[PDB]
Amino acid sequence: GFLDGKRILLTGLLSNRSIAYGIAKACKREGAELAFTYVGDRFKDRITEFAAEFGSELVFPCDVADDAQIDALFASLKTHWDSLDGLVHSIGFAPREAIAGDFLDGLTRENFRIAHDISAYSFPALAKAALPMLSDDASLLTLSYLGAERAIPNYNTMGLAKAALEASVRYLAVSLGAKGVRVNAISAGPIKTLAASGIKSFGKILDFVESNSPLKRNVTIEQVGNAGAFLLSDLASGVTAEVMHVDSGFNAVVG
Amino acid sequence: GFLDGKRILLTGLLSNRSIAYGIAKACKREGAELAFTYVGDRFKDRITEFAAEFGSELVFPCDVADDAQIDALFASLKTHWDSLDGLVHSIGFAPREAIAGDFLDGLTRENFRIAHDISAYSFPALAKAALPMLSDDASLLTLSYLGAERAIPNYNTMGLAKAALEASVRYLAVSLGAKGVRVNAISAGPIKTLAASGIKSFGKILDFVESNSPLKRNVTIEQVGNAGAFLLSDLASGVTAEVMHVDSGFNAVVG
Amino acid sequence: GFLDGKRILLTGLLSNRSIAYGIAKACKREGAELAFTYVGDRFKDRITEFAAEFGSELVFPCDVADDAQIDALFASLKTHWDSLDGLVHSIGFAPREAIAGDFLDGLTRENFRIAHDISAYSFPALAKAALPMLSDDASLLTLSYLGAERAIPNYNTMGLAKAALEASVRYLAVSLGAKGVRVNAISAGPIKTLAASGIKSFGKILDFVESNSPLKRNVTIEQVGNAGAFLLSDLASGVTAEVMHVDSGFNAVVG
Amino acid sequence: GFLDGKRILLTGLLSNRSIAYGIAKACKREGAELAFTYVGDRFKDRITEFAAEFGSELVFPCDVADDAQIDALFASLKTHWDSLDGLVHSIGFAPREAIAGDFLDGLTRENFRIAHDISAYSFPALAKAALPMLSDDASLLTLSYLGAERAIPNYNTMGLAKAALEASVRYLAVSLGAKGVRVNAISAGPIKTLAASGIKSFGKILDFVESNSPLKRNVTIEQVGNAGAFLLSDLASGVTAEVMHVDSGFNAVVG
């Protein structure tokens, strides 16, 4: 495949419906060696099964809230890999009331801090931590959503963080571009995942996109996965600082 | 003027070259009643002179880092005004190494938190706090910069925060829109202010914009001031969730 | 008013519900001297009444399809005015099948040519013809629609033309910017006008915008009129190459 | 490869330096069957060599200015293929004075018409003509430039046309989306091609992009070729109505 010999670290793989899971499957198919992260002592079993499922024994704990675990992540990976080719940032979180009902109702300084801490800062944080062992043609990938660019019901505080996330894609691309590293994001359409359950009336969003998107259909973690695999490969060596919509074209219309 | 009888609160007035100062002058000229905020026990004298200069006795301390001062601000304002017609958010801050040289060099979880805390969160924070005494045709205004949408040298972490700020403009517009309140931002071109001094090689930016902007000239706090006065007025009752460029058109070209 | 002593030529005034009519009323109120154009020998009477209604005797024929009438327009205006301060381009047209049903169904080389000829080319064309008699602080204004940036049902070929129109705003801004002339567009929300009648299911669009816009209301020619007067005035001397949304914020949300 | 069994028609292949040539090479590598078009009785020899070079005997004349040749193109192709999987629109033209010096100097109704006729209309025109023989998972691709979104020196009239082209990408995506057809564009960075020679001071642009792009390097027809191959493949089945930048990230920065 077009990822033969590429070593890729994936975050955010929580279940077999996770976006990170879709990307992992596509990357393995295209011939990459994978490494995974998990959050919390408990999930170690579930993620190891997933890793083994993709032919990997490399799993590392990393709660992006903790600077310690982040530095430890790449110190540990370095004992197995001396060169990192790909990094998949598929991580997001906000207190649930900050993504429910009215934007102001759920707004608190703490909710704001957490949402941006975990959903935005973590990307460039991981990048900075990985820099020393990044190959010269390395590719960094993150996941964003249309809510960053336009106001979407219930998305609220998460929207602000995503806007920051996308801005970081650009500033990262400039900082790491000299070395030859590319940084991109995929703005994915709605997908029924674990995290998606916390967004109020997510079903309304799925129905609406299926009805109004140009392709009249929702996207899959396979379609997002393939797009991700492409951006991580040398096929996209001309692409950086890009926010690529994988949403059946929904962003481009007025529903 | 087109602001006769409007009561407007302005933050960020620090010196006579401040953007907030430009907006203040324009609003007064168009007939508004002004109120001001200052940071730190010390600046009370300097801001009181400015307030008097605009025919106001209303100055209140407000460090947007402190929830207490924010709640106290509108509690105090309520003893003078029972109705707030306008709110000007002209506030920004990041640790200086976070806006110097390389994006990653200046990136730390703390620098990130501070920048977003003060430059982004504070806007919707003030909005939420002012909501109870906001008129039905009230208008909220904030200041942003091209660095949110494109990667600008040295702007770094501030770019991420501004992106979040612009996103909050949209989500605020939806939340307060029902009541009839409008929320907008002005994306101002570079202006030699106090804060601007902290941006490395700011002079290079001024020269470049003057040379490459369609109008071949930099903007003034009077031009930003007038635009702000417009957006705060009923003349712009059809405008909300808008990021208006006041930058001599620089954003629309490739220099 | 903030347009005292400004001489402004308005195209597109067809009925008292026209956007151009809204702009004219606002401009007169703020103290401008107005001049008007009409299409076809017949409408001369109706437009002269309107002109008189705004205290003007200056009406000139100008079918923007004809280079002759365009050059003649400013030759004639020059006999009354030696200096033009403002130009309002409120003109649009496409064959009706090109803005009905399916995009491809209504697509023909001729329909394409006409739509772009009248709706896009005419703006920079009028600009070029007016250049010799334009003041140094002159302001040019055109009207666009969200359909240029996103696909809107039935707008079809008109969307392509508007996209070109908005692009011309930018290139015009660069070309005339040196002299000191500003070029802008207002992206207006849906308004029940004569032309609007030709857009299939225009009523559905009005209802949708009223329901989903942040301000939960449609815009008026008065609100667009005021925005236009602002952009035409020195109050907006810092603004050029801008496409300003006057649509109750509709563009910024997902409905 | 990921294009095994796909039948793709390519326009715009003029020299081994053409963008279409880069795309052709990448598609063949990934396993597609190719067909080519040429303009003018004369170039038939040169294009047949190129086609043979990619293992194809299918070349058809098509001057997109002529409705006749366009209809004849797909009538002829239908005798060899009963199903078209891909269409590559790599065509552009404007009278040379329309892309030299000042925007207004080169502006004439005729120059405007031609530029939009050949560079914008031709895309949806070809699409409509190909519709009857398009497969349900077909993918259409066109080439655009940053000049559509921002004012670039000398690009002038071409910028307007590209803006229209990108708008057509969106309306096309909606019209053909129901059937399952995807429509996308690649916004390519500057590449030294035949057409590029007609843009005044093209060398200045190449140097500037190489110096200021995040990757500090210009792009190749191979990099654009790969991106194009991706968008034409099922790997990108989640992507439509997208304008993908392949420009080393240049668009995302301020140089």
Ligand SMILES: NC(=O)c1ccc[n+]([C@@H]2O[C@H](COP(=O)([O-])OP(=O)(O)OC[C@H]3O[C@@H](n4cnc5c(N)ncnc54)[C@H](O)[C@@H]3O)[C@@H](O)[C@H]2O)c1
């Ligand atoms: N699911 C969708 O419809 C959709 C659409 C667009 C964008 N996205 C974005 O895609 C990304 C991945 O979400 P998903 O939908 O694949 O979901 P998912 O819920 O299956 O996984 C989200 C992951 O985030 C991780 N995470 C949360 N807080 C963390 C922390 N403090 N430290 C480390 N990891 C943490 C979880 O462990 C989990 O693996 C998120 O940024 C989400 O906003 C999702």
Ligand SMILES: NC(=O)c1ccc[n+]([C@@H]2O[C@H](COP(=O)([O-])OP(=O)(O)OC[C@H]3O[C@@H](n4cnc5c(N)ncnc54)[C@H](O)[C@@H]3O)[C@@H](O)[C@H]2O)c1
């Ligand atoms: N100066 C420019 O060229 C320029 C360009 C675009 C945008 N902006 C934005 O305009 C706004 C005004 O900045 P300016 O350049 O006019 O500068 P200025 O330095 O005169 O004012 C900035 C203000 O921020 C205030 N501030 C900082 N930390 C604060 C805190 N914790 N609590 C409350 N207030 C705090 C300061 O007291 C000061 O009054 C900022 O948001 C800035 O990003 C400025």
Ligand SMILES: NC(=O)c1ccc[n+]([C@@H]2O[C@H](COP(=O)([O-])OP(=O)(O)OC[C@H]3O[C@@H](n4cnc5c(N)ncnc54)[C@H](O)[C@@H]3O)[C@@H](O)[C@H]2O)c1
């Ligand atoms: N009404 C809306 O909802 C809306 C929304 C967005 C944009 N617009 C834009 O507003 C502008 C004016 O539309 P309106 O709604 O005020 O309409 P209106 O229907 O009352 O007027 C249309 C105008 O087209 C002009 N016109 C047509 N062919 C012409 C030609 N060959 N030469 C000169 N003038 C010609 C006429 O003078 C007429 O006044 C158009 O560019 C339209 O696209 C309208």
Ligand SMILES: NC(=O)c1ccc[n+]([C@@H]2O[C@H](COP(=O)([O-])OP(=O)(O)OC[C@H]3O[C@@H](n4cnc5c(N)ncnc54)[C@H](O)[C@@H]3O)[C@@H](O)[C@H]2O)c1
């Ligand atoms: N080369 C660049 O730097 C660059 C960058 C971005 C976008 N583009 C776009 O890419 C496309 C191809 O440009 P290129 O640089 O690969 O160039 P190229 O000059 O080698 O090819 C341009 C093609 O236009 C075609 N063409 C011209 N007039 C035509 C007509 N009347 N009918 C049909 N076809 C006609 C010719 O077949 C020619 O091969 C154009 O749309 C151009 O705007 C080019």
Ligand SMILES: Oc1cc(Cl)ccc1Oc1ccc(Cl)cc1Cl
């Ligand atoms: O960004 C998302 C967008 C959609 Cl449409 C669905 C799920 C998303 O992902 C999240 C949603 C809420 C929280 Cl709290 C965390 C995450 Cl990761």
Ligand SMILES: Oc1cc(Cl)ccc1Oc1ccc(Cl)cc1Cl
């Ligand atoms: O945002 C700005 C943009 C420009 Cl071009 C110039 C000055 C700006 O204002 C600031 C810059 C840096 C910091 Cl830390 C704080 C502020 Cl208020």
Ligand SMILES: Oc1cc(Cl)ccc1Oc1ccc(Cl)cc1Cl
């Ligand atoms: O552009 C418009 C957009 C809207 Cl929502 C309503 C009216 C518009 O104006 C026109 C619409 C169609 C044609 Cl043929 C001509 C014109 Cl002037």
Ligand SMILES: Oc1cc(Cl)ccc1Oc1ccc(Cl)cc1Cl
């Ligand atoms: O769009 C382009 C952009 C660049 Cl940077 C270089 C070449 C381009 O393509 C053209 C430019 C001018 C003409 Cl007349 C024809 C074509 Cl095909």
